Amino acid sequence: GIEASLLTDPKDVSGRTVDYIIAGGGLTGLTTAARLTENPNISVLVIESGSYESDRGPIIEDLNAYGDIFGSSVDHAYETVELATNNQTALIRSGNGLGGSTLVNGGTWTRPHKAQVDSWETVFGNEGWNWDNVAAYSLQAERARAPNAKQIAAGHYFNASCHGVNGTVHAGPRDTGDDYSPIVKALMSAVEDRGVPTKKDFGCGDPHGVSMFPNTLHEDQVRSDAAREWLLPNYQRPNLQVLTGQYVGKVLLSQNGTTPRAVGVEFGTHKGNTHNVYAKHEVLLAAGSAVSPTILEYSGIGMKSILEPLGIDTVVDLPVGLNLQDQTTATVRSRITSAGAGQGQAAWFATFNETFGDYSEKAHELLNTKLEQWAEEAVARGGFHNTTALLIQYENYRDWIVNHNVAYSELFLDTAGVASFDVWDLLPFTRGYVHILDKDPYLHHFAYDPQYFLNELDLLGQAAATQLARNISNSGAMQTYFAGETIPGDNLAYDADLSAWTEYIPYHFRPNYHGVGTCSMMPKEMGGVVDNAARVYGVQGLRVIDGSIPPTQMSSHVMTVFYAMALKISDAILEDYASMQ
Ligand SMILES: *[C@@H]1O[C@H](CO)[C@@H](O[C@@H]2O[C@H](CO)[C@@H](O[C@@H]3O[C@H](CO)[C@@H](O)[C@H](O[C@H]4O[C@H](CO)[C@@H](O)[C@H](O)[C@@H]4O[C@H]4O[C@H](CO)[C@@H](O)[C@H](O)[C@@H]4O)[C@@H]3O)[C@H](O)[C@H]2NC(C)=O)[C@H](O)[C@H]1NC(C)=O
Ligand SMILES: Cc1cc2nc3c(=O)[nH]c(=O)nc-3n(C[C@H](O)[C@H](O)[C@H](O)COP(=O)(O)OP(=O)(O)OC[C@H]3O[C@@H](n4cnc5c(N)ncnc54)[C@H](O)[C@@H]3O)c2cc1C
Ligand SMILES: *[C@@H]1O[C@H](CO)[C@@H](O)[C@H](O)[C@H]1NC(C)=O
Ligand SMILES: *[C@@H]1O[C@H](CO)[C@@H](O)[C@H](O)[C@H]1NC(C)=O
Ligand SMILES: *[C@@H]1O[C@H](CO)[C@@H](O)[C@H](O)[C@H]1NC(C)=O
Ligand SMILES: *[C@@H]1O[C@H](CO)[C@@H](O)[C@H](O)[C@H]1NC(C)=O
C-alpha cells in the first residue's frame, strides 16, 4: 500500500524539478503536502529522514505504549549541549519518520488561551495570526468525536462549539476498554475545593482547571499520526511524492538577482553522497525546530558570527536559531490503593497564583521588577540578540499572567495503576539557541542549548508546580487513594519546602520536547526570521512552516495550533502560487 509508493532511491528524484520541496514529513510538512497537492497542478516532493511507521504495530499505534519507541530509530534523540543547570546532556525525543513527532507523542489534544494567539497579531504584528483566525483553521483540521456516557461519567466534558467534526485529524477520548479510574474525579474535587474550575473544555480558548481531554486517535484507539491522517488517504495523488530515508542538508540559493532565491535542495546521508532536487516555486522547511534552523545555517542564512568561523558564506544575516523556548518536566509519582484502579489522564492547567500559592506575592515582585535584568542575561547567554525585543516578549508574558490570567503550569495526571504527575512550567522566560557546529550537514554536529532553568522564575516556577503536584496527590478526595509517594519518594523529603525543591529539580527533570521559536515569526526589527506568511526575510521562495516559527510558548499541547498553523500557511502559499504566474 503506501509503502510501495514511497521512493527510497535518491536517483529517483535527483535532477527533477517540482513546484514545492518540503524538507520534513512531520506534522506540519505532511499537512502542507496534502493541502498543496489538493490542487492537481501542484507537484510536491516531501523528503523525510525516516520512513513509514504508522502500521508498524502497537509501539506506534497504541498511545498507551507511549515512550517504548524512545531510543529506536523512530527517535532522532538529539542530545543537548552539556546543560549548565546540571552539567548533563539531555536527549530531545523527536519522531523520525512520516508523521515526525506525531509518531511518538502522547496524543493530547487541547488549545491555548486566546489572549496568547491574539498576541501574535497585536504584540508581534503578525497580521491575521489571531485567535479567531487560528481557532478557525484549528476547527477545520479537527475531526472530534464526542465522549460517550461512560467517558462523561468518568469526567469528560465536550463543548461541541469548540470542535470541528468535519476535519481530518481524528480526535476523541482515549479508552482502553477498561474502567476509568475514580482518581480523575477525586482530583477534580481536590481542586474544586480550593476554587479551581474543572471540566472546562480545553479546546475552547480558556484552558483552566482540571479537565480530561481528547487524544488524536481513531475510535478504534489507533494513533492519528500525521502520516495516517494526511498522507495515507492521499498517497496515491500523482503530484505528491515522498522520498524516505534521506536527509535534507541545505537549500540551494541562486545569487545573481536582487535577492537570493531558494532554487531547490541538497539531500543525502553522508558528506559525498548528496543529491540536488529543484523547486519551481518554493522550498518549505518543515524539519522541526531543532533542525529547520540548522538547514538555514548550513545554507548561509544565519548570523555571520556563527557562519563565518565555519567557513560558510553568509548570504542573509538573520538571528536564526535564537529564541528557543522549551519546557522542563518533572514527575511526582504516588502509589494508589486498589480502589483507584483504572485508566484515565487529566491535566490541571494552573494559573500563576495557583502554581505559586502562598508565594504569589513574591513571584509577582519578580515578574514586575526583573524583566530587563532577565532580558540582558538571556541575551548575554546567546538565547537572543536584542534586549528590547526580548523585553517586549517578557512584557507580553507579564500581560498574559497579570491581565489575562493564563495558565502557567501544566500538571498532567496519568493513572492506569498509579497517580503519576508530569508537571511543566508552560511559559518559560529562558531563551536558548541552536547553532550548527560544522559546515557538513550530514555530520549532524550541532549545539542545541535550551538553557533550562537559567532564568530563576523558571526554576521557581517549575519547583512550585511540581511541589503542587505532590500536594494535590494527597489532598482532599485524593487522600483516599494515596498509598505512598514513589518518586521523588526517598529522594526528596515529603515535607520539602520550595528551596529544597529548587535544588532537587535541575537533577530530576527532562526536556518537554516542545521547542518552538528558532525561526521566529515576528517582524525583522523584533528579531524575527520569517514574516506573517512564514517567508524567511530577504530570500525569495523560502519558507519555514514548522515549530521553529511560533514566537511564543502556548498554554497547551501544540498539535491543534500546529495543524491550524500549517493550514493557514498552505492557504498563503496557494495565493502566492496563483500570483506567481
Ligand atoms: C558544572 O561544571 C563546572 C566545571 O566544569 C562547575 O564549575 C566549576 O565549579 C567549581 C566549584 O564547584 C569552581 O572551582 C572553584 O574555583 C574558585 C575560583 O573562583 C576557587 O576559589 C575554588 O577553590 C576553593 O574550593 C575548592 C573546592 O572545594 C578548593 O579545592 C580550593 O582550595 C578552594 O577552597 C577555598 O574556598 C572554599 C570555598 O570558597 C573553602 O571551602 C575552602 O576552605 C577554601 O577557603 C574552586 O576551585 C570552578 O571555577 C567552576 N568553573 C570552572 C570553569 O571550572 C559548575 O559549578 C558545575 N555545575 C554544577 C551544577 O554542578
Ligand atoms: C515525546 C514527545 C511528546 C510530545 N507530546 C505532545 C502531546 O502529547 N501533544 C501535543 O500536542 N504535541 C506533543 N508533542 C509535540 C508535537 O508532536 C510537535 O510539536 C509536532 O510534531 C512538531 O511538528 P513539526 O512539523 O515541527 O515537526 P516534526 O513533527 O518533528 O517533524 C519534523 C520532521 O522532519 C524529519 N526530519 C528531521 N530532520 C530532517 C532532515 N534533515 N531532513 C528531512 N526530514 C528531516 C523528522 O524526522 C520529522 O518527521 C510532543 C513531542 C514529542 C517528541
Ligand atoms: C461553548 O463555547 C463557547 C466559547 O466560545 C461558549 O460561547 C458556549 O456558550 C460554550 N458553552 C459552554 C456551556 O461552555
Ligand atoms: C460536514 O459536512 C457534511 C456534508 O458535506 C455537512 O452535512 C455538515 O453540515 C458539515 N458540518 C459542519 C458543521 O460544517
Ligand atoms: C494574583 O495574586 C496577586 C497578588 O499576589 C494579585 O495582585 C492578583 O490580583 C491575583 N489574582 C489573579 C487572578 O491574578
Ligand atoms: C531591537 O528591538 C527593538 C524592539 O523591537 C527595535 O525597535 C530595534 O530596531 C531593535 N534593534 C536592532 C538593532 O535591531
DSSP 38-84: TSTT--EEEE-SS---TTS-HHHHBGGGTTTTTTSTTB--EE---BT
Distance from C-alpha of 432 to C-alpha of 16, rounded to nearest angstrom: 38
Q: Which residues contact 132 (CB under 8 A, 6 or more apart)?
A: none
Q: Could you say which DSSP state residue 480 is in?
A: G
Ligand positioned closest to the Cα atom of 99: 2
Tracing cell 467517558 back to the chain, one arrives at 151
Give yes or no for residue 364 CB within 6 A of ligand 5: yes
- Torsion angle of the four alpha carbons 372, 376, 378, 380, in this order, in degrees rounded to the nearest 10: 180
Q: How was this structure determined?
A: X-ray
Distance from C-alpha of 390 to C-alpha of 375, rounded to nearest angstrom: 6
Structurally, what CATH architecture does the domain formed by 1-50+234-322+433-449+517-551+569-581 represent? 3-Layer(bba) Sandwich (3.50)
Distance from C-alpha of 509 to C-alpha of 140, rounded to nearest angstrom: 36
Residue 194 CB neighbours (<10 A): 12
Rg for the chain, CA atoms, rounded: 23
Q: Which residues contact 154 (CB under 8 A, 6 or more apart)?
A: 180, 181, 184, 185, 212, 344
Residue pair 485/333 in contact by the 8 Å Cβ criterion: yes
**Ligand 6 midpoint to CA 386 (Å):** 7
Closest CA to 429 of 482, 472, 376: 376
Which residue has the CA at smallest separation from atom 5 of ligand 5? 361
- Torsion angle of the four alpha carbons 378, 437, 29, 299, in this order, in degrees rounded to the nearest 10: 110
Which set of grid coordinates corresponds to residue 162? 469548540
Closest CA to 90 of 457, 449, 579: 449
The residue type at 106: G
Q: Could you say which DSSP state residue 181 is in?
A: P
Residue pair 440/272 in contact by the 8 Å Cβ criterion: no
Cis bond before residue 147 (omega within 30° of 0): no
Three-class SS state of 3:
helix
DSSP states along 491-560: GS-TT--HHHHHHHGGGS-EE-S--B-TT-BS-GGGT-SB-TTSBBTT-BSEEE-STT--SS--SS-THH
Tracing cell 474525579 back to the chain, one arrives at 185
Distance from C-alpha of 278 to C-alpha of 16, rounded to nearest angstrom: 6
Alpha helix (H) residue ranges in 230-331: 292-298, 304-307
Residue pair 214/145 in contact by the 8 Å Cβ criterion: yes
Class of domain 108-215+323-368+404-432+450-516+552-568: alpha beta
Which set of grid coordinates corresponds to residue 331? 514527575
User: What does the domain layout of the chain look like in residue ranges?
Assistant: 1-50+234-322+433-449+517-551+569-581, 51-79+91-107+216-233, 108-215+323-368+404-432+450-516+552-568
**Ligand 1 midpoint to CA 464 (Å):** 29
The residue type at 140: Q
By CB atoms closer than 10 A (0-12, 13-18, 19+), residue 317 is middle
**Whole-Å CA distances, 364 to 361, 403, 457, 505:** 5, 12, 10, 21
Residue pair 563/169 in contact by the 8 Å Cβ criterion: yes
Resolution in angstrom units = 2.3
**Whole-Å CA distances, 564 to 32, 111, 136, 339, 559:** 11, 11, 8, 41, 8
Closest CA to 265 of 29, 568, 530: 29
> Is 514 designated active site?
yes
Give yes or no for residue 266 CB within 6 A of ligand 2: no
The rounded Cα 303 to chain-centroid distance in angstroms is: 25
The residue type at 407: A
Distance from C-alpha of 223 to C-alpha of 26, rounded to nearest angstrom: 14
Distance from C-alpha of 513 to C-alpha of 503, rounded to nearest angstrom: 22
Angle between helices 360-380 and 456-473 (to 10 degrees): 140
Residue pair 207/200 in contact by the 8 Å Cβ criterion: yes
Which residue has the CA at smallest separation from atom 10 of ligand 6? 525
Q: Could you say which DSSP state residue 230 is in?
A: I
Three-class SS state of 260:
coil
Which set of grid coordinates corresponds to residue 201? 473544555
Give yes or no for residue 353 CB within 6 A of ligand 5: yes
The rounded Cα 562 to chain-centroid distance in angstroms is: 8
Backbone φ, ψ for residue 273 (5° rounding): -140, 60
Residue pair 230/33 in contact by the 8 Å Cβ criterion: yes
Angle at 448 between CA 72 and CA 459, to 5 degrees: 100
The rounded Cα 297 to chain-centroid distance in angstroms is: 21
Q: What pairing do the DSSP bridges indicate for beta strands 328-336 and 482-487?
A: antiparallel
Sign of the C-alpha dihedral, residues 182, 183, 188, 190? Answer: positive
**Ligand 3 midpoint to CA 100 (Å):** 33
Residue pair 296/544 in contact by the 8 Å Cβ criterion: yes
Q: Does an H or E element contain 247, and which?
A: strand 247-254
Backbone φ, ψ for residue 453 (5° rounding): 60, 20
Count of residues in the chain: 581
Distance from C-alpha of 305 to C-alpha of 291, rounded to nearest angstrom: 19
Class of domain 51-79+91-107+216-233: few secondary structures
The annotation places the binding site at 27-28, 48, 101, 105-106, 108, 248, 535-536, 547, 559
Residue pair 240/34 in contact by the 8 Å Cβ criterion: yes
The residue type at 220: D
Distance from C-alpha of 180 to C-alpha of 318, rounded to nearest angstrom: 51
